[PDB]
Every structure is written in structure tokens, then in C-alpha cells.
């Protein structure tokens, strides 16, 4: 009865995601296209309250619905898959790739040892594997996932449904670029759940794979803090260690959300923040405007 218990638990986990997606799916209508309207309409009264990003994500969900319906035509084939990674072809159109959780463990660790250990031992091992998968998957797909209608979740988090093997997920789809690692580590490769099947217990995610673009007429200057002596004491200038200059305009930057490489600063959005005029005047050259702080630690650059 392990599979039935697991199905019940997984349905309990998956139903809220399906309902959240249905809130936008049910209230998004594709009117007959013409020259007067070039897109689909969102039912604002039915949505009620939504941020701009959530509405744009609903639009993206609609645009996904076409290929989602194409994929769901192969629902019987999806259920029949018994391999970890499988490729589905029917008319050489939009070849569907299917990743199955724990299928490699079933094929390489339980079926080969079914002769060697008792049926109760194998059943307990299977139940343990499913429960560990639920314990690890809950951090990402549990109640922590409040807004499933969003393309802001990184593919590394999305891949927890596939044991966190996002490398297999990305290479299966065929993505390849010089900035693969730079896009990955900067949280720029994201995914969005576009379909949940409660009967077959599978989901369809849409991977958003962007390209890095150099921001023209912009650089990011770094300052190396060094303790300086004044009045028989050691001091450190309390100044932005990273300054963003774009079109010769000085602004602060939230580096913490960016990937710093030796050549450039890679960010998944514009993380520029304003700078007070006194800090800008000190960086401009009015050193009496930059504050300092006493150095009491034995170890400081």
C-alpha cells in the first residue's frame, strides 16, 4: 500500500499548486484574434488583487498553455515511462522530454536486489525512498511556494522535484552557451510550473533561459578598504566598496544579489539603488564627507 499512501500525500501537496494556476487559467480568455486585439484579456475583477509581476506571469502561463496542451496529448505515454530520462516522438514535432523522480533508484537499486532481500525489506526501502524524496521536495514545493504563477523561481529550486539534478534537466533540453555557469550561478535561469496533473502525478515546467547583455556605457568600480592611521588610532572608511557608474552617473548597487566575476558583474535584474548626496560628494573628492570607523580588531586589511 506504499504507492497509495504516497499518491495521497503527493495529491495533498500538489492540489494547492493546481488551484493557484487554475485561478489564472480559468480567468484568462483567448478571444478570437483580429486586428483590434493582439493579445488575451485578463479578468481583473475575477483576479481581484495581483501584482504586476503576477499578472505578467499569468500571461506567460497562457502562452505556455498551447505547448502544454500539445504535451498532454501524450499523457498515456507519460504514465508508461519507466526510465529516468525518456524522449517522446510522434510526428517529429516538439519532442517531449520526461524526467521521472526516483526511477533510477527503482531500476538500479530495488529491482536488481529484489531477489536478494525479502519483500517486506524491499517495501520498507521503497517507502523510505519516497519519504526522503518528500522531505527534500517539501522545502521547495510545499507551503513555501506561495505564488506558483511566477517565472521567478530558479531552475535549481525547480529541479528539486528531480532530486536537484538541474544539470540533467538543462542538458536534456539541449541548452548550451558560454555563459551557462554564469547564468546558473547568477540565478538567471528560471522555471515556471505550467501544468499539474493530480490524476497522473506529473507536472510540466517551462524553463526560461536568457542571454547576458552588456549594459552599455556602464561599469562597476570596486574599492579595496585599507586601515589608515589618524590621531594614534586605526580607522576604516565607511564607504561603498562597489560603486555603479552608468552614463557617468554614480549610484549604489545591491551586489549581494549579483554574481561577481573577475571580468564583469552579472545580475538577473537592475540592482541599482540611490546614493545620498554626501556620499556622492565624498566619492567626488570631498574626503571630509566620508565617515570612518575605529579599528579595534587584530585582523583588518
Amino acid at each position, epitope marked *: 500500500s506504499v504507492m497509495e499512501n504516497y499518491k495521497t500525500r503527493l495529491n495533498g501537496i500538489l492540489t494547492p499548486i493546481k488551484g493557484a494556476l487554475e485561478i489564472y487559467k480559468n480567468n484568462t480568455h483567448d478571444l478570437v484574434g483580429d486586428v483590434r486585439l493582439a493579445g488575451v484579456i485578463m479578468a481583473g475583477v475575477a483576479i481581484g488583487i495581483a501584482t504586476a509581476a503576477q499578472i505578467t506571469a499569468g500571461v506567460a502561463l497562457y502562452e505556455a498553455m498551447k505547448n502544454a496542451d500539445n504535451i498532454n496529448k501524450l499523457k498515456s505515454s507519460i504514465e508508461s515511462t519507466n526510465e529516468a530520462v525518456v524522449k517522446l516522438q510522434e510526428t517529429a514535432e516538439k519532442t517531449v522530454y520526461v524526467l521521472t523522480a526516483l526511477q533510477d533508484y527503482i531500476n538500479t537499486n530495488l529491482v536488481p536486489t529484489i531477489d536478494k532481500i525479502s519483500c*517486506k525489506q524491499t517495501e520498507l526501502s521503497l517507502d523510505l525512498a519516497l519519504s526522503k524524496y518528500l522531505s527534500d521536495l517539501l522545502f521547495v514545493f510545499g507551503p513555501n511556494l506561495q505564488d506558483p504563477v511566477s517565472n521567478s523561481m530558479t531552475i535549481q529550486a525547480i529541479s528539486q522535484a528531480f532530486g536537484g539534478n538541474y544539470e540533467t534537466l538543462l542538458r536534456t533540453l539541449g541548452y548550451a552557451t558560454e555563459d551557462f555557469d554564469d547564468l546558473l550561478e547568477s540565478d538567471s535561469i528560471t522555471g515556471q510550473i505550467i501544468y499539474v496533473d493530480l490524476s497522473s502525478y506529473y507536472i510540466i515546467v517551462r524553463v526560461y533561459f536568457p542571454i547576458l547583455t552588456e549594459i552599455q556605457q556602464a561599469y562597476i568600480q570596486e574599492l579595496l578598504p585599507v586601515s589608515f592611521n589618524n590621531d594614534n588610532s586605526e580607522w576604516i572608511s565607511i564607504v561603498p566598496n562597489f560603486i555603479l557608474v552608468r552614463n557617468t552617473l554614480i549610484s549604489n548597487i545591491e551586489i549581494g544579489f549579483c554574481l561577481i566575476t573577475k571580468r564583469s558583474v552579472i545580475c538577473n535584474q537592475d540592482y541599482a539603488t540611490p546614493m545620498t548626496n554626501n556620499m556622492r560628494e565624498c566619492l567626488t573628492g570631498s574626503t571630509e564627507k566620508c565617515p570612518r570607523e575605529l579599528v579595534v580588531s587584530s585582523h583588518v586589511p
Partner: antibody
Framework: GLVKPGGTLTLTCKASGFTLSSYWMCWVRQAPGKGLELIACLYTNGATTWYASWVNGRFAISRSTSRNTVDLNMTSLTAADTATYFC?????????????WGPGTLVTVSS | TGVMTQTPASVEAAVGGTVTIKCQASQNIISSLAWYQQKPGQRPKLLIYYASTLASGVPSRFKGSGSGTQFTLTISDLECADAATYYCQSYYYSGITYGNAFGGGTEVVVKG
């Protein structure tokens, strides 16, 4: 074996070579001179049940869980229900082939 | 639903020959097929499980084969005691897809 058209009957498993709760258990029926037909299985947890498409709630499985028995309940019986009803254990806890077949109980509907 | 098309209904073959029974599943069952032997007035006897694996104590002349939709059962070096009705059954259980059915049956009779 005696029963009246429209009556009810309750059968019991006669395997008795193991603990009944730990194994996959179907009820197989076979009309005289006809092929084997699967009626209904019962998971080891005891709540989830499998039913063929044709029963439609006419048959029901339960276990005594204390005397180590498994029962089958029948209602609205007809001449087609005349058969030998086999209690078949299925080799494992989950879905599987049967390696133990019960002796079976003859059932005859007739005025 | 799930159904099993088993051919042929009956068949004749002389002692020492080979007979081939075939079972067709409406849906893919992924090698989850069994084969049973039943003699009149007796309980069935398990012959083959998982389409290929022979049950313990079953002679090797019974050979099963197949995967997915099509499966075969071949009995070589036929004996008199082999005459019986032969059934197949699907016990498919992926976890989300349920496929369980019995074959119609094949009556084999050996020419002595």
C-alpha cells in the same frame, strides 16, 4: 452454495497458510466451463480496494483482521453469478501474479 | 478499461510438438504478465510470471515471451499431461495506471 435470485451471500478465504493481512488478495470467479474472471482485490492497508469495471459496487471485500479471514459480499444475484469463487493470494504485498489459490466455494442461484 | 485478447480459443497438437498461445493487452503492461495452467476440476497452477520468468518447479519447455502489448506462450516437447486450459493475466501496477484482466483462455488437447 444455495442462494435465491436477488439474495445475498458472504464467502471466506480458505488459504490459511500465512498471515492474510501481509499479502495481495483477489477474488477470482469461474463460471462452469467458462474462463477465469477477476472480481476484486484488497490492498494490505485494508481501505483501498480494486474492482473490475462490471461489478459496480455489487461486490465488496473486507477482512476480519482478527480471525485472519477475508470476505466477499454479493447482492442482486442472477443466473450469470453461478460460478466457483476462488480466493487467490498474490505472491506479494502489492499487485502481482497469484501463486496460491484457495479451494473455492461453489455458488448456485436457483429457485 | 483493460481487456485481454487471447488467441486461439482451442488448439490441437500431437505429442512431442510445439503449441503457441498469444495474449494481447489493450494497453501497455510493461512485461507484467502471468501464465497459469488449469486442469478441469482443479485449481490453477502458476506457470510463468513477468512474461519470461518460470515459476519454481515448472518444466523448461514452457517458454514465455513478449513486452508491452503482445505476448506469446510456447510449449515444446508436448506431453499428454500438458492438456489443460491455459490463461494469461495482467497485474500491471505502475502506481498511477491500473491494468488487471484475465485472458479468455486457450484449451489445448494433445493427440496421443
Amino acid at each position: 452454495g444455495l442462494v435465491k435470485p436477488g439474495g445475498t451471500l458472504t464467502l471466506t478465504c480458505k488459504a490459511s497458510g500465512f498471515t492474510l493481512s501481509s499479502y495481495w488478495m483477489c477474488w477470482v470467479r469461474q463460471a462452469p466451463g467458462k474462463g477465469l474472471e477477476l472480481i476484486a482485490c484488497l490492498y494490505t492497508n485494508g481501505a483501498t480496494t480494486w474492482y473490475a469495471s462490471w461489478v459496480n459496487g455489487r461486490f465488496a471485500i473486507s477482512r476480519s483482521t482478527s480471525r485472519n479471514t477475508v470476505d466477499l459480499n454479493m447482492t442482486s444475484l442472477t443466473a450469470a453469478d453461478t460460478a466457483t469463487y476462488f480466493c487467490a493470494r498474490g505472491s506479494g504485498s502489492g499487485w502481482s501474479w497469484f501463486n496460491i489459490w484457495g479451494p473455492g466455494t461453489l455458488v448456485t442461484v436457483s429457485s | 478499461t483493460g481487456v485481454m485478447t487471447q488467441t486461439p480459443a482451442s488448439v490441437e497438437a500431437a505429442v512431442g510438438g510445439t503449441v503457441t498461445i498469444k495474449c494481447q493487452a489493450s494497453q501497455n503492461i510493461i512485461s507484467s504478465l502471468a501464465w497459469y495452467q488449469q486442469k478441469p476440476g482443479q485449481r490453477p497452477k502458476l506457470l510463468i510470471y513477468y512474461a519470461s520468468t518460470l515459476a519454481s518447479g515448472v518444466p523448461s519447455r514452457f517458454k514465455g515471451s513478449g513486452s508491452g502489448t503482445q505476448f506469446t506462450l510456447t510449449i515444446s516437447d508436448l506431453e499428454c499431461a500438458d492438456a489443460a486450459t491455459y490463461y494469461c493475466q495482467s497485474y500491471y501496477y505502475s502506481g498511477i495506471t491500473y491494468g488487471n484482466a484475465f485472458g479468455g483462455g486457450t484449451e489445448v488437447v494433445v493427440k496421443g
